[PDB]
Structures are given as structure tokens and as C-alpha cells.
Symmetry: C3
Subunit: 341 residues, 3 copies
């Protein structure tokens, strides 16, 4: 365009999910956030990962909720976990001593691992023993000085005989309480479409038990209790990135779902979603300054019933993306009009 | 302002709801979206309209929900239907063969047509027969390769005798299930203010059964079952316009609630809501460029309990409307300062 | 920077919560909005205040909900009350004649006043009498020509014996109905963490009964009925300000949580939240124009389960704050580049 000029825009991503500042992300792989937290057997991240720089999820992961059901506030949980830099996966309710008189080792084929029927690892499918499902009243007091992510579930069996078998009551209930949180779940029994060869459901629920707060579970049946929980360490700059790009042990300053960015420029256009010390996104292509003469992630953050939000958010993000872009162009269009003197 | 100048702003709307690209809108008239979908008798659009370019609703339509009650996620449904370019109204559950042993032809005065008591046309008010309301288990499998909008309802009668009469049970339930969607409704019996001379209620519910998914209804009473559903064809550019302006068989490129726009200009100010190839809205009035010398609809998108959203959305839309406007003015204010050379 | 210049930015707040246009705010003090509306005894604003220019709340007020429980749509109520310029606190259900055969004067230590156990003042804790809790069916018809804010509550006692004592039924219910509003509450009985030395809960509910609409309460127990309600007078410019700054009987044109603003300038940076005829916020510090040569409140508007909203709103507000700021700077940066001629 002119003899001397400087480009400000970076359009080249290394096409890989590098390290960030020398810390490594968490690759869920086939697994989704729901399976990871719940401990879907196919994930194997449980024992091995507790820290990262960012989380990596694939566009359409299939290994999430193995036993069909509704994961309440799934997207709110995603937004919670975006800011989690690390955590501690601890056995809030030890399987061995917490449930002496309840048949742990409830298992389903819908969650099979290596061919054998199994179940989530961070949860527990309680069932009666010796013909009893005695009322349970287990409690946990968050004394870890970090907010504790607790998971649990309620089994909505397909028929009354199944419930009578698992729990030996027709009219069971699940009560979960804390200092603020109070809720009661009754199982809904009904035949349903046979997802993953299973005709029942499990409703998955969660809450962030704050330090000092005490959470109580009461139940005469239908509880998928927690075996492990998570003590969360919040962190800025981290976040969740949806992508299927490969990784090497490259290190970078910025990261984006298509690839990392390792360049001094202020701007870029590969993708607005970004993590770390990164250039700022624009839609443009031609940011040249003459020197001579002649944010949050997106995509799965909202569910069916929230399409307003998405639209609104689509209206907002996209708006700003345009807005600043224009200004940026204008700024150079001004500056070139000036620095041509 | 100067000898030579070009105006960029269009402030003249033809005051009519023309055709768009030669396709005709859907004029609900007195009827609202709720009555249209539910099939409020006063609408008469059912047999006759299945396609359009945009939907037209009046500010305060009175012919919507004839039998009083809460239409769940009404606004979410509006946002769903904004993107519907057309659909197919089909008899998911034929009245004649789907309910052989249940008294169809339940009717109320609150939905009267031509003086005779009647009922919604896209719904069915089941009632017992021969002293029985046998449990029903009807199912539908979406094999139409398009997402299917299903409607239904639950009758909350004013008193226990009314329920015992209609359904011959005091403790009825309604279970609606799909691959994800699972829900259970119990009728709430109570005397209430006598809206449209009716002391009971009907809670209206809906869902988008995706292709291949199977929806099951179970009930021992209190079901207002569907007679017709809708297979949706999504479409960009379409949308919902709230207005009372008249129509002629004029054709236009753009449309707005006050009137259409047929002009080459890039900008305008008649209304931000617009459909089709349209000039872009601003608040301004004086966009002149010298050549010489000296989005989504709005208004009813949110309910009572969501006034944050509206405020937020009001904060956003109005913001951008201002923002760009300024820039536009600035752009000309700059350009005139330049093109005066 | 240059010999002649004018500053446009105001960075000095008087550090006090003055009057606005000569009208005085409402200082809740220790009390929060919830306690104020509910009538937490420690507030004493009830008899004495019904009008203001704005509301003042402290960052972490401790005197709100005295009897533990969930205040439904608390934040939506805050947003409702932001636009309330005044109201009329009237005894919708007179304690003396509305509940002849129900033991008013239910009291708890969790709401103690001056050492004596007491209870909210705008609510009523009904309890049985002479061994009966006869079904009640009290009603109110809004004939005040202003929307009426109604409050009520449901006692979820810690154990079945407590409920049997207060209400002499194990399976109570609370039905609240209006022309649109219909709802039913069943008490959930469970031992819980002993907040404010209380092991039960009260779920607080509200609604805006519009003029002409009739609200009906039905109950066989567990009702914390209303004693007073509020007829609301909407008003622009008013709002809610969260702060702990002191007050004098100073008068001002604008107000902000850190302090008032009394200055002619168009801009400022002390705080974006503002009330009244105020300069417009920016982040900047150096707005000088040469003449020579060389919105809504924020912070508590959303709850736990809504962190998307907050993020979104944080994304929006902060965005605009930046955006306009830039433009403003640009505008002067342009103008100085021009007015230096
Ligand atoms: C985990 O995902 C795998 C697939 O990624 C599931 O295994 C089977 O995958 C094939 C395709 O490779 C499907 O056709 C099968 O239907 C899958 N199995 C079943 C039983 O349907 C596996 O089921 C998933 N398991 C969990 C726990 O997520
Ligand atoms: C449809 O709306 C019409 C009015 O547009 C309703 O008919 C009556 O309208 C008059 C005013 O013209 C009202 O005073 C009456 O109260 C209305 N009827 C009743 C029974 O109140 C009609 O009821 C509506 N019907 C439906 C099914 O929407
Ligand atoms: C109102 O708030 C006061 C505190 O501002 C509460 O009174 C006690 O305050 C001290 C601290 O000054 C705490 O250590 C005590 O725990 C408080 N009392 C109790 C019983 O815990 C008072 O309880 C509050 N009351 C209401 C109705 O809000
Ligand atoms: C699922 O995970 C397994 C094990 O890592 C892998 O072999 C497979 O490729 C993954 N699924 C897909 C679609 O790649
Ligand atoms: C569990 O059951 C055994 C059965 O003998 C009993 O001895 C024991 O006390 C029970 N423990 C708990 C914690 O319920
Ligand atoms: C309602 O529809 C009827 C029939 O089209 C019409 O006569 C009437 O004018 C409509 N209502 C109003 C207020 O115009
Ligand atoms: C309906 O009832 C009739 C009564 O004789 C019975 O013959 C028939 O089998 C029933 N059909 C269904 C579908 O319930
Ligand atoms: C609570 O209110 C009382 C009475 O006005 C006051 O003495 C006390 O200082 C307030 N609390 C705090 C923390 O200031
Ligand atoms: C209240 O109870 C008394 C008991 O004698 C009875 O006389 C009176 O009719 C009752 N009133 C109401 C309103 O229930």
C-alpha cells in the first residue's frame, strides 16, 4: 500500500494446544465436563490431574453422562469450572466407612468400562442391604477453607418394581440441606425412551458448599450419593476451550481453540476466545500503520430453554467484536491519514 | 448546510405491512402467538397458513389463551418461532383413533366461537368415558426429520368435585417424557379469581421433540392432550414484528413495525427493529455527506420475573443504538471535515 | 500540556450521601432490603419512611432475613424496588380482625428485638388456636389503583412434631392464587444446620398484585401470612446504592456510592453508578480540551446460580464503560488536534 508499513494483526495460529506459561492444560478427550466431574470411567483423569492452565473439550464429546438424566445447572457448573485453576478430589464420604449398612457397588451397563458394567467413580449408587434401606443422615462440614463442589444424584427408575428392588420403598425421597441450600426430590417413576439401553434416569445435582457450611443428606431411597467431591481453587486467566486440535509439548503465551499464538502483535483475528497474554481480537484483515511515504468462551454456555441468553450474548459479543474492530480500523485509518505527513 | 450534499438517512416509512421479497407475512390480528399455536378458535389461520416472511402481532392482542392459565416459557417459545419461516401442522394424535376410550369433545365457554362453547383446535381436552378415565400411554416418534413443536396442557380445576367429574380421580398426575425431557405435573385444586368466567386454570407446556426422539404422555387425568403439532422449518431474516399497521399488497425489501422501507440509503431512523435487506438504524436526523464547497425484536420478549433481562437488554440494544449512531455521526463529521478540501 | 486548556473530568466526590434535589434517601443501615420489606425489627424505618430519592444499603448488611430461609426472587425484588420512588405500607390483613381464630403472636428468638424474642413486623406467623388450625381462605382485592407488593412465607419446620404443634397437621399446604399467579407450597420437614440458633426455615415469597386483581391465600398450616403490604409508586432516576458512606444534610444534584457530585462538568470517574443529573462516567484521567496554543446499579443484582448473568452484565457494563471512554478520549484527541490550529 506504501513503501514503509507495519502490520498489527496476527492471522497465524500454530494449530496446536500448547502449554501456557509452561503449565499444561487438561485434555478431557472424548469425555465432557459432566463425565469428568461425575467421574465417567472412560476419563481416567481423576487420579492423575488436579491442576492446569485451561480446560480442553471437544465440540461433541460423547463420553459424558453415562446413565441418562438431566444434569441440573450444567452450564452454570461449566461457568464455575472455567475459573477453577486447580482442585483437590477428596473422598468426602468414604465408600468403606460412610455406608456400612447400605449396598454400595450398584452398577449399570450404561456406564460400562472395558466391557464390564461399572459406574461413575466420583459418585456412589447406594442400594439396600439385607432387605433394608435404612434412613441415612450423613453430613459433611466444609473445614477445608475452600468452597467444596458437591455432586449427587437421584434415581428415577423406570418402574415401581425396580424402585422397590433397589430401595424397598414405593414413596421415597431425597433431602439435601445446607445453611442456605435446601431441597427435596421425589423420584418420578415412568417408562421412558431407552437411552443407552436404559429406561430410567438419574437427575444430577450439585452445589458449592462454602467453608464452615454443613451439608446434610437424608434419604429413604433413590440417592446416588457422592464418593468424591472437589475443593476449588479459583483462578483468573484460566477458562474452558472447546476444540479438537492436537497438542505437542510446545509452550506459548496465548492460546485459542484453533491454535496458540506466539507473536508480539497487539491484535489478531484467528479467534476471539483466547487465554493468556494474547493479542486482542478483531474481524479485520488489513491493519497496516505507515511509517514513511508513497471476555468469555462461548458455544455451549446455554441450554435449550435459554436461547434468549445465547441470542443476547451473541448480540453482545458479536457487537463488541464489530465495534472495537471498527474503532481499530478507524484508529489506523486516522493515523495513516496523519502519519502520512 | 453546503451547496452539494448527499443524505444517507431515510426517515419515511410507507406506513404499511407490505410483502417481503414477494412473500406474505402472517397477520394474527386479534390473536396472539399463544392463541395461534394453541389454536384459539378466533384465529382461523390454522388450515390456511403455514409459511410467511415474518409474523405480525398487535401490541395488546386479546385473543390468546382463552382458558386461563400459565403458558410456560411463553417468551422462549416466541423466540423459537421468530426463526420459523414455515411449518407443517399435522395431527400427531388423531382425535378419532388416538383416544378411542376417552371422551374427547371437552369444551368450555371461555373459548367460545360464534356463540357456541368450543375449545382450542390444536389441543384436546380429554375426559373420562362410561365412568372411566383409563390410564393412557400414547407415544409419538419424531420421524419427520424436522424438530417437532409439541403442545399440551394440564387442567387445574377449581374444586375436587370438578376433577372427580372430568377424570374420576382425586390424585391424578401427568407425566411427559422424552430422551431428555422428563417432567411430572400434579394438578393443584383451588378456587381462584374468575377470569373469563372460569375459576380453574390450564397450565400450557411445550417442547421441541427432535428428530428420532420419542415423546410419551402418561396420565390418569387432567391432561389437555395435543391434537396437532408443528414441524418447524428454521429461517434467517424472518422474525416477529409487533404492530397494528395496515397492509396492502405492496412489496418491499425491508419492513418495520411502523412501515416498510423502499430506498437505497444505508441508514434510517424510523425503527431499529427491521426485517430484510434494510438500512441500518440510528437515532440521528442529519446525516449529510458533502460533495462540493460552501438484531432482534423487543417489547414482549420477557415476563414479570425477568425484568433484569429486559433492563439488561434495554441497556444493551439502546447502548449499541447510541454507540454506532455516534460513530456514524463522527464518521460523517470526520468525512465532511475532510471532503471539504 | 499547553498554555490554555479546560478540564472536563470530575474526580472529587464530597464523600457523603447528600440529599438529592432536596429530597432525602432511605438509610437502611445495618438492615438490608429483605429485612426492610419483611420488617426486620432492627430497622425501625417502617412507621417513619415511605418516600425518598434513592435507597442506601451497606455492602454486607447483617440485619436482613432474621429467620433463616430463601427469599425467592430476592434480586428481582431489588430491581423492582430500585424504581420505587415511594409507597404506602398498609395493613392488607389486619392482625386483629383478619385472623380471629388463629393464634397470631407467633415469635422466635432468631428475630429478637431489645432482647425479647419477636418477629417480622410486615409479616404474621399464624399458628393454631384451641387445638385447631382451621382452613383459612382470606382474600384481598387490589383496589388501590397501584400495584401492590405482597409478601408471605412458608415455614419449613425442623421436625414433624414442631409442625404438628404449630399447625396440628402433618401434611399441610399453602396455596396462593391470583388472576395469573398460582402456586402451591408443601412444607419440607428436615433437620438442618442451626443458623441463628434455628433449625427450621422460612421460604419467603412475593408478588405484585396488579390493580383490580384478587389474591387468595389458602392454607391448613405453615403460613407466614402478611400483615402489611406495599402499594408502589414507580419513579425514574431513583435507584439503589450500595455503600457505607456517611450523610450530612447536604444537598446535591448527583450522587454516587463514594460520594456526591456538585460540579458543572460533563464527565467524571469516581464511580459509574450514579443518581440524578450527573456527569457521565469514564475510566480516564486526563480530559483536557485546548483553547489556545503552546445505567443501573451493580454488585448484588444476581445470586449464586446466575453467575452467567453477572459475567454477562460485567462483560456489558465494563464494555460500554471502556467503549465510550475511548471515544471520549478520541473525541478530545481529535479536537485538540484540530483546535490547536
Ligand atoms: C463412551 O463413548 C463411546 C464412544 O465414543 C461409547 O462406546 C460405543 O461407541 C460406539 C461408536 O464407537 C457406539 O456405536 C456405541 O453405541 C457405544 N456404546 C454404546 C453402549 O452405545 C461408550 O458407550 C461411551 N461410554 C461412556 C461411559 O461414556
Ligand atoms: C376474543 O376477543 C374478543 C374481544 O376482542 C372477546 O369477546 C368479547 O369482547 C368484548 C369486547 O369487544 C369483551 O367486553 C368481552 O368480555 C369479550 N368476551 C368475553 C366472554 O369476555 C372473546 O371473548 C375472545 N375470545 C377468545 C377465545 O380469545
Ligand atoms: C442484627 O444484627 C446484629 C448484629 O449487627 C445481631 O446481633 C448480634 O451481633 C453480634 C455482633 O455484634 C453477633 O456476634 C451475634 O451473633 C448477633 N446475634 C445473634 C443472635 O447471633 C442480631 O442478631 C441481628 N438481628 C436481626 C433480627 O437481624
Ligand atoms: C475415544 O477414546 C478412545 C480412547 O482414547 C479413542 O481410541 C477414540 O478415538 C476416541 N473417540 C474418537 C471418536 O476419536
Ligand atoms: C450396621 O448394621 C450392623 C448389623 O449388625 C450393626 O451392628 C451396626 O450397628 C450398624 N451400623 C450403622 C452405622 O448403622
Ligand atoms: C377482533 O376481530 C374481529 C374480527 O376480525 C374484528 O371485527 C375486531 O375489530 C377485532 N378487534 C378489534 C379491537 O379491532
Ligand atoms: C376401548 O374400549 C372398548 C370397549 O369395548 C374395547 O373393546 C377396546 O379394546 C378398547 N380399546 C382401547 C384401545 O383401549
Ligand atoms: C448496627 O446498628 C446499631 C444501631 O444503630 C449500631 O450501634 C451498630 O454500629 C450497627 N452495626 C455496625 C457494625 O455498625
Ligand atoms: C371464630 O371462632 C368463634 C368461636 O366461638 C366463632 O364463634 C366464630 O364464628 C369464628 N369466626 C370465624 C371468622 O371463624
Amino acid at each position: 500500500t506504501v513503501t514503509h508499513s507495519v502490520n498489527l494483526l496476527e492471522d497465524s495460529h500454530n494449530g496446536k494446544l500448547c502449554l501456557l506459561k509452561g503449565i499444561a492444560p487438561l485434555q478431557l478427550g472424548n469425555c465432557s465436563v459432566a463425565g469428568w466431574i461425575l467421574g465417567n470411567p472412560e476419563c481416567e483423569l481423576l487420579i492423575s490431574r488436579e491442576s492446569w492452565s485451561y480446560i480442553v473439550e471437544k465440540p461433541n464429546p460423547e463420553n459424558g453422562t453415562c446413565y441418562p438424566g438431566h444434569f441440573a445447572d450444567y452450564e452454570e457448573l461449566r461457568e464455575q469450572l472455567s475459573s477453577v485453576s486447580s482442585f483437590e478430589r477428596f473422598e468426602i464420604f468414604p465408600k468403606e466407612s460412610s455406608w456400612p449398612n447400605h449396598t454400595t457397588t450398584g452398577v449399570s451397563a450404561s456406564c460400562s468400562h472395558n466391557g464390564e458394567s461399572s459406574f461413575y467413580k466420583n459418585l456412589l449408587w447406594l442400594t439396600g442391604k439385607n432387605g433394608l434401606y435404612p434412613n441415612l443422615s450423613k453430613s459433611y462440614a466444609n473445614n477445608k477453607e475452600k468452597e467444596v463442589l458437591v455432586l449427587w444424584g437421584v434415581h428415577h427408575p423406570p418402574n415401581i418394581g425396580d424402585q422397590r428392588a433397589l430401595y424397598h420403598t414405593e414413596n421415597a425421597y431425597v433431602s439435601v440441606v445446607s445453611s442456605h441450600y435446601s431441597r427435596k426430590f421425589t423420584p418420578e417413576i415412568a417408562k421412558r425412551p431407552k437411552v443407552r439401553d436404559q429406561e430410567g434416569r438419574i437427575n444430577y445435582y450439585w452445589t458449592l458448599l462454602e467453608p464452615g457450611d454443613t451439608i446434610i443428606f437424608e434419604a429413604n431411597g433413590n440417592l446416588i450419593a457422592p464418593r468424591y467431591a472437589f475443593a476449588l481453587s479459583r483462578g483468573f486467566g484460566s477458562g474452558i476451550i472447546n476444540s479438537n486440535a492436537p497438542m505437542d509439548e510446545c509452550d506459548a503465551k496465548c492460546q485459542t481453540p484453533q491454535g496458540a499464538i506466539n507473536s508480539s502483535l497487539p491484535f489478531q483475528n484467528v479467534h476471539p476466545v483466547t487465554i493468556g497474554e494474547c493479542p486482542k481480537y478483531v474481524r479485520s484483515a488489513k491493519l497496516r500503520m505507515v511509517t514513511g511515504l508513497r471476555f468469555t468462551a462461548v458455544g455451549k454456555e446455554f441450554n435449550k430453554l435459554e436461547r434468549r441468553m445465547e441470542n443476547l450474548n451473541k448480540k453482545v459479543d458479536d457487537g463488541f467484536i464489530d465495534i472495537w474492530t471498527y474503532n481499530a480500523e478507524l484508529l489506523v485509518l486516522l493515523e495513516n491519514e496523519r502519519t502520512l505527513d
